[PDB]
Amino acid sequence: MKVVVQIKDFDKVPQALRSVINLYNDIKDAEIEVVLHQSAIKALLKDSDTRSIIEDLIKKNILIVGCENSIRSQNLSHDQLIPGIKIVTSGVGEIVRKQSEGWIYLAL
Amino acid sequence: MKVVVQIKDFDKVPQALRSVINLYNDIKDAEIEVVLHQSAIKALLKDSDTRSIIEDLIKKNILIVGCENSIRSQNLSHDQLIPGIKIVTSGVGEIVRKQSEGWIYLAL
Amino acid sequence: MKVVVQIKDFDKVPQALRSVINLYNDIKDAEIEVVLHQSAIKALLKDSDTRSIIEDLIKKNILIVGCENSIRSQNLSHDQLIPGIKIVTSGVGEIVRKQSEGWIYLAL
């Protein structure tokens, strides 16, 4: 079950991440990709309060993706992001493309 | 027309419910399922300010679903929820599954 | 690539519009329709702070759509909206219908 998850609001990241954990626990063999854009990109910073949760999702083989446009608008450096994070040119472009590829969309 | 509606933010429930009413009025013979998770689950409490609206949606044959994970994290009891409410193990799992079954997704 | 974009929160319109610009720049020959409903409808007012951005999207051949139900609940007049704006009876009905027609959904 392929699911492309979107997270855009930084203030809702904690709840969004718990929801992703819920998804993982509920759908057997789920193939999950989480795309963070807009202000939510800040959650991928090395000193992020949700770093341990993000690292746990990575351990669970979940693909964590950050939006380049968002990284740039938030004045962040790739050097400052959690290691092992994939980046796409556009978070919204990725979300749309994955859906066209058959991935089920979930907005958090 | 099968539509699976998601509502996750408690502070936006009033507007979300009005939007569902709008959907109902706009799409003839719509088959609607509303899944509430995260903080929005509180709207399904018996003393909820939106109870009368929820009851009206039920009257209109709309399926109202509450997330068990969310009920648990909000420390709520099934005894405290509006009668006639269906519950799923995971709100996000339900949203994803209905979409895979052909239901059109609407995030409110 | 057909994409139906939803924007419902007025306080998030600036970021949503930038995200639409990002979509446009990222997906070659994207066919985009943006549906604004709930409080976001206010962004289509003639004296709107985002008017110039909306006009730019229109220039880029992006279809800008406003929800009639939302226009009514916000006590707005069609005379007060940006010229060239299309209106639908229900923003949510449009979002659902476009998806059933094969348009990819993006919630902003």
Side-chain angles (χ1 to χ4, degrees):
Chain A
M1 180 80 94
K2 293 173 165 58
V3 186
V4 60
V5 180
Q6 166 199 40
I7 304 181
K8 54 175 172 284
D9 301 304
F10 181 66
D11 58 353
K12 298 177 182 179
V13 169
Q15 284 179 294
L17 298 183
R18 174 171 56 270
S19 287
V20 173
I21 289 175
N22 287 341
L23 178 61
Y24 174 85
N25 289 324
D26 198 59
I27 300 184
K28 178 174 183 174
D29 297 316
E31 206 180 320
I32 307 159
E33 175 181 327
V34 185
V35 176
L36 299 83
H37 66 118
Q38 294 195 348
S39 68
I41 190 68
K42 292 182 293 178
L44 303 183
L45 283 168
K46 281 174 175 179
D47 64 322
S48 167
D49 293 323
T50 49
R51 176 165 180 173
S52 63
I53 299 179
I54 290 171
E55 298 178 309
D56 179 57
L57 296 181
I58 290 179
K59 186 75 174 183
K60 288 172 165 58
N61 196 41
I62 289 176
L63 179 58
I64 303 303
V65 172
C67 169
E68 172 71 51
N69 286 319
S70 299
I71 288 173
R72 294 180 179 185
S73 62
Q74 288 293 322
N75 295 321
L76 302 184
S77 171
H78 303 333
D79 287 41
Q80 319 177 313
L81 305 172
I82 294 168
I85 287 305
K86 280 58 171 179
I87 295 168
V88 295
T89 63
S90 170
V92 295
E94 174 72 353
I95 289 168
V96 168
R97 278 188 287 273
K98 300 310 298 181
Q99 284 189 73
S100 71
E101 283 163 39
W103 292 57
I104 296 172
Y105 175 43
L106 175 61
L108 293 175
Chain B
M1 180 80 94
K2 293 173 165 58
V3 186
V4 60
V5 180
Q6 166 199 40
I7 304 181
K8 54 175 172 284
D9 301 304
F10 181 66
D11 58 353
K12 298 177 182 179
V13 169
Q15 284 179 294
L17 298 183
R18 174 171 56 270
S19 287
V20 173
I21 289 175
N22 287 341
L23 178 61
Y24 174 85
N25 289 324
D26 198 59
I27 300 184
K28 178 174 183 174
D29 297 316
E31 206 180 320
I32 307 159
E33 175 181 327
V34 185
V35 176
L36 299 83
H37 66 118
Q38 294 195 348
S39 68
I41 190 68
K42 292 182 293 178
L44 303 183
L45 283 168
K46 281 174 175 179
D47 64 322
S48 167
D49 293 323
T50 49
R51 176 165 180 173
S52 63
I53 299 179
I54 290 171
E55 298 178 309
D56 179 57
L57 296 181
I58 290 179
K59 186 75 174 183
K60 288 172 165 58
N61 196 41
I62 289 176
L63 179 58
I64 303 303
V65 172
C67 169
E68 172 71 51
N69 286 319
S70 299
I71 288 173
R72 294 180 179 185
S73 62
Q74 288 293 322
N75 295 321
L76 302 184
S77 171
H78 303 333
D79 287 41
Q80 319 177 313
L81 305 172
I82 294 168
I85 287 305
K86 280 58 171 179
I87 295 168
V88 295
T89 63
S90 170
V92 295
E94 174 72 353
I95 289 168
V96 168
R97 278 188 287 273
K98 300 310 298 181
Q99 284 189 73
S100 71
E101 283 163 39
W103 292 57
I104 296 172
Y105 175 43
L106 175 61
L108 293 175
Chain C
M1 180 80 94
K2 293 173 165 58
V3 186
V4 60
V5 180
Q6 166 199 40
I7 304 181
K8 54 175 172 284
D9 301 304
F10 181 66
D11 58 353
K12 298 177 182 179
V13 169
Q15 284 179 294
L17 298 183
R18 174 171 56 270
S19 287
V20 173
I21 289 175
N22 287 341
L23 178 61
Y24 174 85
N25 289 324
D26 198 59
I27 300 184
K28 178 174 183 174
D29 297 316
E31 206 180 320
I32 307 159
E33 175 181 327
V34 185
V35 176
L36 299 83
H37 66 118
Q38 294 195 348
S39 68
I41 190 68
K42 292 182 293 178
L44 303 183
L45 283 168
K46 281 174 175 179
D47 64 322
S48 167
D49 293 323
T50 49
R51 176 165 180 173
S52 63
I53 299 179
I54 290 171
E55 298 178 309
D56 179 57
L57 296 181
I58 290 179
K59 186 75 174 183
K60 288 172 165 58
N61 196 41
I62 289 176
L63 179 58
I64 303 303
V65 172
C67 169
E68 172 71 51
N69 286 319
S70 299
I71 288 173
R72 294 180 179 185
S73 62
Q74 288 293 322
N75 295 321
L76 302 184
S77 171
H78 303 333
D79 287 41
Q80 319 177 313
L81 305 172
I82 294 168
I85 287 305
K86 280 58 171 179
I87 295 168
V88 295
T89 63
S90 170
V92 295
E94 174 72 353
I95 289 168
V96 168
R97 278 188 287 273
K98 300 310 298 181
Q99 284 189 73
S100 71
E101 283 163 39
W103 292 57
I104 296 172
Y105 175 43
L106 175 61
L108 293 175

